[PDB]
């Protein structure tokens, strides 16, 4: 289960993680700037990003978890991944991506 | 503000062994879950394993982590990862995080009704470990 | 005005108890040898009249969960099973090389070598097996299967006269203990019951036998009823008892029979003799169940608020648990409960196929396997489905779609089904009071 | 006369006593249900013999409605006899009173049923 | 008060009674300890019930310190009440008195608790 592997300046980022089929509470995504740790963006809508103010959300296509980063003009910051644990005692990740801006 | 932190590592021998443990700050460590990753070099992210809050609520990831072990101890700093028979597959930055959850872990498992919530809260620095 | 200590004797005061409880029934034949696993008159037939009486104004806090009876019955019934089985054949001469063949699916036709009544001749002997009786010995080879126990456990075949058939038992409280009954249907097993009564001995509690769905246990009134330890523990069992009955008549469509072989000089074993061959099935016509569940979903919503609800299959875990399962006659069914639990329940303006088995691991113990006697019959079932052991999805899956799967989460909870109404209690006759007096 | 009936106010409840007393004592190769019966009967008998033993050292196993001049200690509930017999009720009464009872179940065994012949010393001996 | 206490002189020993009475009655598949407990409780119950039966036919189960006008037979030990209650002591008493006791343990069940309504006949019938 994964997101797919650019934007121009002033646009806002939106990416789905699942890989043609995922559902339910199996939803999560964490940002990074390389060298720093990974970074919380969302878990289950009441645990949330410290540094994208109020400008990011979940959503679903019918088959997706979604990095709904739709107000994040703080956009140069963009590398992300997904994670979950709902399989057989088993943590899981979406393989993540950068998005360049300039 | 809170910082999530671990042991210094080594340029470990292939087939060697290692230990890394919690040395985090800003909160009462208070059983809150172990959590770490194989941030494999030039890759994205992958688990540490499944993980413990109070000891005995943890599992390997798959069969794969069976060569390692995990601990909590009476001393809360011993939220610890023990590494043995080390592969090139084990390698990466062992960044770590607080967990947004506080409960046990079990039921009739696989795909059936375990409630016990698991979740990654804020995240802190870690050591790149390679062979 | 002044006062003294006085005692009235036998005044009604009572509290919960670790007390032991003993069986009663009607006398099925009075003789100690009457064919039965539960109460072959080794249980004493104490008065079949429940001489119950009304608890007028007496309000009581029930506790279905810290009840003593669950663990007591659970320990007791397993012991009944053992002391019905010890008198009959252990099957140490039965773990052996099995040869099998594939025939019209999952009912293998097989033969093996064994002792006879003489401890010399390898008698070649023949039996059917439902596929889940066996595993391959080491490799995918036609001569190379073993009975599914032998891996870790020994087996015991009951005389076909230990009848698993669920004759009721009544638990009696011994004197100086008593049973309080919640005398309402509009009730769940924690907190007060406003209307109540007492009896020395329970109204018939099915020894039941269920695995996932309540069989044979009685109905409620006013509403469909739900019982659980703590409903916020999504993982732990939820019981439903219906306001309406439903009936299932599962059948072995195959004319299959008691062949018999003496696996030692006193040791009669029942081999499965054959007659086309079809899978076991059941008739329960969908629409009665469907609109029944529609109302079950509403009682569940009475906790949860306005969610669309699903019932979905048990999955992944051991088939001994994850199929719905019960005896009929003396053979055990294991049904793909999906066909009755693959269903969706909106808020707005709103048949099973099955497998048989011979070996079972009852109460999920180690050792002490039971190989069920193949019954002489085109076996049939004539029985009421009456309730559901639900499990609610551990995924808290916020506020859109929350849902359930049936489970076999404890056979204790298969008893809780009917036990819930009975609070077993000690009476303390120790009535201290103020009054005034002088010695006579 | 009914069994239980504790919601009868305590005096009216005492219109019944002895039918409950019968319920204290009778229900009104080895094998599993046989060992269970044997154990059950003994536990009921030994528990029944404990309360008869109380009605030894409390007195009154003869006169099964009991007298002593042992103090009603004003540290206990001050509820009126009038409330007690004609509005208040047995389970509810014990659930009020049990917090005192471990005093009473010893302070009851005063001289009347523990020492009184030591006082008959002055009545019958010089 | 203590248990035992026989070395207190018999009168002062009687400052304790009822607590020893409790000790007569409670300590204050087959399985091997299980059957042994079951036998043990029955033997204790029956032995406790044997002394209640004595306290039947001797009287005084209703009054656990006891009276009869049955003769103290001067063939027994002549030791004074003063010695007995205030210098002598229960084991050392029974070990002097056992030789007589079997006579008493029958002669005690005289008419007062063995026959007396045959004499209440004179008190209440013409
Ligand atoms: C509760 O579940 C039970 C099974 O777990 C059901 O119990 C019995 O199950 C067997 C096997 O399906 C049934 O089949 C046979 O029934 C006859 C009955 O003989 C008597 O009745 C006929 C007329 O009906 C009469 O001709 C005879 O003279 C007898 O008077 C037995 O002889 C067989 O051995 C065998 O049991 C039973 O019919 C069935 N019911 C009973 C009451 O035994 C049970 O039906 C379920 N009950 C409910 C309420 O759900
Ligand atoms: C409540 O959650 C469940 C999942 O837990 C939703 O299940 C839906 O089930 C159908 C099959 O019954 C799934 O399969 C098919 O998907 C394709 C593509 O979406 C569609 O073209 C087919 O018609 C069919 O639906 C479906 O993917 C799955 N839907 C989702 C979003 O997981 C159920 O729909 C949820 N309830 C509601 C009211 O949405
Ligand atoms: C698989 O099931 C078959 C069919 O029941 C077993 O085959 C043979 O069954 C017959 C009875 O129908 C046995 O006796 C013979 O019957 C025919 C008439 O049907 C008769 O002409 C012969 O004189 C004889 O009485 C026969 O013994 C039995 N075959 C064997 C190998 O014993 C078969 O046993 C089952 N498979 C296995 C692996 O046992
Ligand atoms: C009952 O026991 C007898 C032996 O007392 C069994 O006979 C044996 O059957 C096998 C085939 O199943 C014969 O073939 C040989 O098997 C070996 C071992 O895998 C293999 O290495 C050889 O190449 C060959 O295929 C064998 O000759 C035969 N006799 C003996 C003495 O072993 C009989 O099959 C058993 N029947 C049942 C129903 O249990
Ligand atoms: C039917 O079942 C309910 C429980 O399912 C029985 O009473 C309820 O018991 C629960 C647990 O003891 C109580 O819940 C707690 O309430 C507090 C205060 O509001 C809340 O902060 C906690 O989070 C928790 O929810 C609940 O108050 C209690 N009472 C009611 C009215 O539901 C109830 O006795 C059973 N009723 C019948 C008629 O059988
Ligand atoms: C369980 O839930 C599943 C998924 O929502 C339901 O499965 C769908 O059932 C319909 C019939 O109600 C199937 O349509 C039929 O398919 C056959 C073969 O293509 C065709 O001959 C018929 O004309 C009709 O179109 C459908 O294939 C099936 N879809 C899936 C994804 O399995 C099912 O009804 C529910 N109930 C049970 C008892 O499983
Ligand atoms: C399997 O199907 C049979 C019908 O073929 C069901 O009925 C039983 O059929 C057998 C013959 O296959 C009957 O045996 C015959 O009975 C007469 C009269 O008693 C006797 O004179 C003959 O010598 C022969 O024994 C049998 O009576 C009949 N009924 C029963 C209860 O066996 C049979 O019910 C089906 N099998 C099972 C196990 O249910
Ligand atoms: C065990 O027996 C001894 C005696 O062998 C008790 O010790 C003392 O016994 C005398 C018996 O006369 C008690 O009375 C006292 O007598 C002396 C003269 O002998 C007198 O001067 C005192 O004023 C008093 O009358 C004496 O109280 C007692 N003293 C104690 C308490 O040690 C001993 O008490 C007995 N122990 C037990 C059973 O606890
Ligand atoms: C009986 O032996 C079988 C075969 O060796 C064992 O079953 C397999 O066990 C592994 C784990 O060790 C599972 O991954 C497989 O899915 C099992 N296969 C089947 C068909 O069950 C089994 O563990 C042994 N014990 C019991 C009680 O069955
Ligand atoms: C399947 O069964 C047939 C008889 O029904 C037999 O001829 C064949 O050898 C069997 N094959 C296997 C792989 O069991
Ligand atoms: C199912 O149970 C009810 C009583 O709970 C009974 O009336 C009904 O007849 C039973 N079903 C059958 C087939 O007898
Ligand atoms: C049981 O559940 C699984 C999902 O856990 C589902 O794929 C399957 O179709 C269900 N039914 C059966 C008979 O496997
Ligand atoms: C209980 O008290 C009520 C008073 O409202 C009375 O009518 C009823 O008969 C009493 N029940 C008994 C006697 O337990």
> Closest by alpha carbon to C20, among E21, B111, D39?
D39
Evaluate: CB of C105 within 6 angstroms of ligand 10. Answer: no
**Residue with CA at minimum distance from ligand 7 atom 32:** C377
Distance from CA of E109 to the nearest CA of C (A): 24
Q: H-helix or E-strand containing C5?
A: strand C4-9
Rg (chain C; Cα; Å):
25
B92/B98 Cα distance (integer angstroms): 19
Closest-approach residue (CA) in chain D for E36: D39
Q: Contact, A27 vs A44, CB < 8 A? A: yes
Evaluate: CB of C50 within 6 angstroms of ligand 11. Answer: no
A25/C116 Cα distance (integer angstroms): 60
Q: Contact, D107 vs D70, CB < 8 A? A: yes
Pocket test for ligand 12, best of B111, B112, B113, B114 (most atoms within 8 A of CB): B111
> Closest by alpha carbon to C340, among C327, C350, C328, C353?
C353
Longest dimension (CA), chain B: 42
Three-state DSSP at C173 gives coil
Q: At what angle do helices C69-85 and C411-419 cross, to 10 degrees?
A: 120
Q: Contact, A33 vs A83, CB < 8 A? A: no
Distance from CA of C400 to the nearest CA of A (A): 10
CA distances from residue E66 to B117, C156, E7, E80, E83 in whole angstroms, order as listed:
72, 63, 22, 19, 20
**Residue with CA at minimum distance from ligand 5 atom 1:** C188
Per-position b or e across C48-78, b if 16+ CB within 10 A of its CB: eebebebbeebebebebeebbbbebbbebbb
What lies within 8 Å, CB to CB, of D119 at 6+ separation is: D111
What lies within 8 Å, CB to CB, of D80 at 6+ separation is: none
Residue E29 near chain C (CB below 8 Å): yes
> Closest by alpha carbon to C263, among C375, C412, C106, C371?
C371
Strand partners, C333: C326, C356
Q: Where are the domains of chain E?
A: 1-125
- 10 Å CB burial of residue C126 (0-12, 13-18, 19+) is middle
Tokens representing residue C190 in the block:
């924690």
> Closest by alpha carbon to B22, among B92, B80, B82, B102?
B80
DSSP letter string, C174-238: PTTEEEEEE--SS--SEEEESSEEEESBPSPBP----SSEEESPPP-SSS-EEEES-TT-SSS-E
Query: Nearest bound ligand to CA C325?
Result: 1
Q: Spell out where C45-121 has E strands.
A: 53-54, 60-63, 99-101, 107-114
Judging contacts by C-beta atoms under 8 Å, the chain A residues touching residue B120 are: 28, 30, 40, 43, 83
> Closest by alpha carbon to E22, among D46, C10, D25, D118?
D46
Q: Which letter does DSSP use for residue A10 in this model? A: T
Closest-approach residue (CA) in chain B for C396: B115
Q: At what angle do helices E18-25 and D32-57 cross, to 10 degrees?
A: 170
Closest-approach residue (CA) in chain E for D125: E81
Size of interface C-D (CB pairs under 8 A): 184
Closest-approach residue (CA) in chain B for A29: B120
Rg (chain A; Cα; Å):
13
C269/C259 Cα distance (integer angstroms): 8
**Residue with CA at minimum distance from ligand 1 atom 4:** C328
Residues in chain D: 126
Q: What are phi and psi of A43, to 5 degrees?
A: -135, 120
Q: What are phi and psi of C299, to 5 degrees?
A: -65, -40
Alpha carbons within 13 angstroms on the beta-carbon side of residue C211 total 22
Residue B10 CA to chain centroid, in angstroms? 17
> Closest by alpha carbon to C5, among E76, D111, E18, B99?
D111
- 10 Å CB burial of residue C106 (0-12, 13-18, 19+) is middle
Residue B121 near chain A (CB below 8 Å): yes
Tell me which residue has tokens 């540490």.
B48
Tokens representing residue C40 in the block:
């072959």
Q: Which letter does DSSP use for residue B3 in this model? A: B
| D and A in touch (3+ CB pairs within 8 angstroms) | no
Neighbouring CB atoms inside 10 A of B66's CB total: 12
Q: Contact, C12 vs D6, CB < 8 A? A: yes
Handedness of CA E72, E77, E82, E86 (dihedral sign): negative
Q: Contact, C380 vs C249, CB < 8 A? A: yes
Per-position b or e across C264-293, b if 16+ CB within 10 A of its CB: beebbbbbbbeeebebbbbebeeeebeebb
Query: For residue C84, how far is its CA from the centre of ligand 3 (angstroms)?
Result: 34
Tokens representing residue A89 in the block:
């005692």
Helix intervals (H) in C305-340: 319-322
Q: At what angle do helices D32-57 and D18-25 cross, to 10 degrees?
A: 130
C234/C231 Cα distance (integer angstroms): 6
C397/A25 Cα distance (integer angstroms): 5
Q: Contact, D67 vs D60, CB < 8 A? A: yes
Residues in chain B: 131
Neighbouring CB atoms inside 10 A of B130's CB total: 15
Q: What are phi and psi of E105, to 5 degrees?
A: -60, -5
Q: Contact, C284 vs C293, CB < 8 A? A: no
Q: What is the dihedral of CA C315, C316, C319, C322, to 10 degrees?
A: -30
- List the single residue in E11, E34, E48 with the smallest CB-CB distance to D49: E48
Tell me which residue has tokens 């993982």.
C235
- 10 Å CB burial of residue D119 (0-12, 13-18, 19+) is exposed
C155/C146 Cα distance (integer angstroms): 12
Neighbouring CB atoms inside 10 A of C437's CB total: 14
Secondary structure in 3-state letters for chain E: CCCCCCCCCHHHHCCCCHHHHHHHHCCCCCCHHHHHHHHHHHHHHHHHHHHHHHHHHCCCCCCCCCCCCCCCCCCCCCCCHHHHHHCCCHHHHHHHHHHHHHHHHHHCCCHHHHCCHHHHHHHHCC
Q: Do B113 and C396 touch (CB under 8 A)?
A: no
Query: For residue C395, how far is its CA from the centre of ligand 2 (angstroms)?
Result: 17
Neighbouring CB atoms inside 10 A of C368's CB total: 18
For chain B, first and last CA: distance in Å? 33
Alpha carbons within 13 angstroms on the beta-carbon side of residue C66 total 9
Q: Which letter does DSSP use for residue C160 in this model? A: G
Per-position b or e across C187-221, b if 16+ CB within 10 A of its CB: bbbbeebebbbbbbbbebbbbbbbbbbbbbbbebe
Q: Contact, C160 vs C330, CB < 8 A? A: yes
**Residue with CA at minimum distance from ligand 10 atom 1:** C102
Q: Which letter does DSSP use for residue A68 in this model? A: B
Distance from CA of D23 to the nearest CA of E (A): 19
Query: For residue A22, how far is its CA from the centre of ligand 9 (angstroms)?
Result: 30
D68/D71 Cα distance (integer angstroms): 9
Q: What is the dihedral of CA D70, D71, D73, D74, to 10 degrees?
A: 150
What lies within 8 Å, CB to CB, of E43 at 6+ separation is: none
Residues in chain C: 440
């Amino acid at each position: 289960a994964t997101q797919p592997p650019s934007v121009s300046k002033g646009e806002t980022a939106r990416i789905t993680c699942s890989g043609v089929e995922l559902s339910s509470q199996y939803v999560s995504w964490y940002r990074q700037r390389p060298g720093q740790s990974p970074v919380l963006v969302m878990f289950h809508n009441n645990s949330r990003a410290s540094r994208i103010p109020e400008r990011f959300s979940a959503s679903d296509s019918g088959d997706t978890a979604t990095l709904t980063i739709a107000g994040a003009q703080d956009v140069d910051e963009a590398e992300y991944y997904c994670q979950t644990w709902d399989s057989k005692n088993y943590v899981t990740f979406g393989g993540g991506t950068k998005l360049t801006v300039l | 503000e809170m910082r999530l932190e671990e042991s210094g590592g080594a340029l470990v021998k292939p087939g060697g062994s290692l230990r890394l443990s919690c040395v985090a700050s800003g909160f009462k460590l208070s059983e809150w879950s172990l959590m770490w990753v194989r941030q494999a070099p030039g890759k994205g992210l992958q688990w540490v394993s499944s993980i413990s809050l109070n000891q005995d609520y943890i599992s390997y990831a798959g069969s794969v982590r069976g060569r390692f072990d995990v601990f909590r101890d009476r001393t809360q700093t011993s939220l610890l990862l023990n590494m043995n028979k080390l592969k090139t597959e084990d390698t990466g930055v062992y960044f770590c995080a607080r967990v947004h959850a506080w409960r046990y872990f079990d039921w009739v498992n696989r795909r059936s009704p375990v409630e016990k919530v698991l979740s990654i809260d804020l995240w802190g620095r870690g050591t790149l470990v390679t062979v | 005005e002044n006062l003294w200590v006085t005692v009235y004797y036998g005044v009604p005061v009572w509290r919960d108890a670790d007390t032991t409880l003993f069986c009663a029934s009607d006398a099925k034949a009075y003789e100690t040898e009457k064919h039965n696993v539960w109460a072959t008159h080794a249980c004493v037939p104490t008065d079949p009249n429940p001489q119950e009486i009304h608890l007028d104004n007496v309000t009581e806090k029930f506790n279905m969960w810290k009840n003593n009876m669950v663990e007591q019955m659970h320990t007791d019934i397993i012991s009944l099973w053992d002391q019905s089985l010890k008198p009959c054949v252990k099957l140490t001469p039965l773990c052996v090389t099995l040869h099998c063949t594939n025939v019209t699916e999952g009912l293998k036709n097989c033969s093996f070598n064994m002792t006879t009544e003489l401890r010399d001749k390898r008698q070649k002997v023949y039996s059917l097996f439902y596929r889940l009786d066996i595993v391959p010995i080491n490799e995918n080879q036609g001569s190379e299967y073993r009975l599914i126990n032998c891996n870790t456990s020994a087996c015991t075949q009951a005389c076909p006269k230990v009848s698993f058939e669920p004759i009721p038992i009544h638990y009696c409280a011994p004197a100086g203990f008593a049973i309080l009954k919640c005398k309402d249907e509009g009730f769940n097993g924690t907190g007060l019951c406003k209307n109540v009564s007492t009896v020395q001995c329970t109204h018939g509690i099915k020894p039941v036998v269920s695995t996932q769905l309540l069989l044979n246990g009685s109905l409620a009134e006013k509403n469909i009823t739900i019982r659980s330890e703590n409903i916020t523990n999504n993982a732990k069992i939820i019981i439903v008892q219906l306001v309406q009955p439903v009936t299932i008549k599962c059948i072995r469509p195959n004319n299959n029979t008691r062949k018999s072989i003496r696996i030692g000089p006193g040791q009669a074993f029942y081999a499965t003799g054959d007659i086309d061959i079809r899978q076991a099935h059941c008739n329960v016509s969908r629409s009665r169940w469907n609109k029944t569940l529609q109302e079950v979903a509403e009682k569940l919503r009475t906790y949860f608020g306005n969610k669309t609800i699903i019932f979905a299959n048990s999955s992944g875990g051991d088939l001994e648990i994850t199929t719905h399962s019960f005896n009929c006659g003396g053979e055990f069914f294991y049904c793909n409960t999906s066909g009755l639990f693959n269903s969706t329940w909106y808020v707005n303006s709103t048949t099973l196929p099955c497998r048989i088995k011979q070996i079972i691991n009852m109460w999920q113990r180690a050792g002490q396997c039971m190989y069920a006697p193949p019954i002489p019959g085109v076996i049939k079932c004539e029985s009421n489905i009456t309730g559901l052991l639900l499990t609610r999805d551990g995924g808290k899956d916020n506020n859109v779609n929350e849902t359930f799967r049936p489970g076999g989460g404890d056979m204790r909870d298969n008893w809780r089904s009917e036990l819930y109404k009975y609070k077993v209690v000690k009476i303390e006759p120790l009535g201290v009071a103020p009054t005034r007096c002088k010695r006579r | 006369g009914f069994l239980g009936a504790a919601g009868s106010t305590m005096g009216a409840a005492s219109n019944t006593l002895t039918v409950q007393a019968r319920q204290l004592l009778s229900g009104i190769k080895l094998t599993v249900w046989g060992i269970k019966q044997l154990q059950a009967r003994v536990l009921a008998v030994e528990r029944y013999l404990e309360v008869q033993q109380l009605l030894g050292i409390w007195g009154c196993s003869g006169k099964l409605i009991c007298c002593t001049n042992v103090p009603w200690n004003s540290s206990w509930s001050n509820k009126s006899l009038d409330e007690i017999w004609n509005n208040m009720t047995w389970l509810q009464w014990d659930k009020e009173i049990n917090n005192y009872t471990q005093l009473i179940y010893r302070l009851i065994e005063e001289s009347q049923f523990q020492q009184e012949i030591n006082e008959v010393e002055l009545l019958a001996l010089d």
